[PDB]
Amino acid sequence: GDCGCSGASSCNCGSGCSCSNCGSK
């Protein structure tokens, strides 16, 4: 639920998150 993404509006979805910044490797 967003919580670690310093970008993507905090989109740390990790899984669903698409963009790389949204959740690097």
Q: Is 20 annotated as a binding-site member?
A: no
Q: Is 17 annotated as a binding-site member?
A: yes
DSSP 1-25: ---S-SSTTT---SSS--SSTTS--
Half-sphere exposure of 2 (CA within 13 A, CB side): 6
CA dihedral for 15, 17, 19, 20, sign (positive or negative): negative
CA gyration radius for the chain?
Answer: 7
- CA 12 to chain CA mean position, Å: 3
What's the CA gap between 25 and 12, in Å, rounded? 12
Q: Is 1 annotated as a binding-site member?
A: no
- 20: CB partners within 8 A, 6+ apart: none
Q: Is 4 annotated as a binding-site member?
A: no
- 18: CB partners within 8 A, 6+ apart: none
